[model samples]
Target: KVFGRCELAAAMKRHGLDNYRGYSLGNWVCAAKFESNFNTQATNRNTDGSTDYGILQINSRWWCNDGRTPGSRNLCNIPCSALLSSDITASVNCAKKIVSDGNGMNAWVAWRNRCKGTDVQAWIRGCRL
Candidate 1:
């Protein structure tokens, strides 16, 4: 729990995510709201035997290694628990790689279902960046 929306926006801006992949910073903010509510230690178990990790809820199926699962792409090359920490640099770097792989923000179900095409200005409201 290292951030409120304003703090998150500031961090995102510092990490160059304000317009990474041409998506607005608000997209990530909104997705984070639904995914983890800015809690860095957030995690969820899926019905499909996979778990979502961290603020972005990245899946163990394709992203990080949870150790309980095998054959993970582990594209981030990091332990899943790493994303569950207050320090988010690794998470942001991995997310950037995911977006660059052409999924864009669509890689996140929260972004696709909640943030995409929705008015998300409130996600960054009061953050004068």
Candidate 2:
């Protein structure tokens, strides 16, 4: 399930955003680009042989009380495609709020500091609000 430009755009839209050209949405775009290059169906193999799926490259291990069953957790337990169900503007706005209100930028800064001096923008620019 490789996602092309359109699918990726759809994914972005689902998250309540439109384009990936701005700052906040730009962060989402960049993270996904680094994580999986906007591939919504992207997945990674767990050590226990399970699978982590979705666009944000969410990990299944991060799922604990995400409400859904253990077998269906991706991108912080939000289904990758589901993340794209929102309109683009709405998506980016929502993400901006989350990043500012939640621990979003803080985490990004930590990562940026760690990955500084080499592709930091690729790893962290789009991560901030």
Q: Candidate 1, 127: how far from true, in Å?
A: 0.9
Give the Cα lDDT of each candidate. 0.87, 0.43
TM-score of each: 0.94, 0.42
| Top-scoring candidate (lDDT) | 1
Off by over 4 Å in 2: 1-14, 17-23, 46-51, 64-101, 105-129
lDDT of 1 at 89: 90
What is the C-alpha local distance difference test score of candidate 1? 0.87
Candidate 1 off by > 4 Å:
none
**Top candidate (TM-score):** 1
Compared with the true structure, what per-residue lDDT tens digits does model 2 show for residues 1-129?
Answer: 445544554455565553323333444544555555555445566676454444444434443222333554332334334434323332244344435544653333322444323443343332222
Query: With candidate 2 superimposed using the best TM-score fit, by how many Å does residue 92's alpha carbon deviate from the native?
Result: 9.6
Assess the local accuracy of residue 42 in candidate 1 as a C-alpha lDDT between 0 and 100. Answer: 91
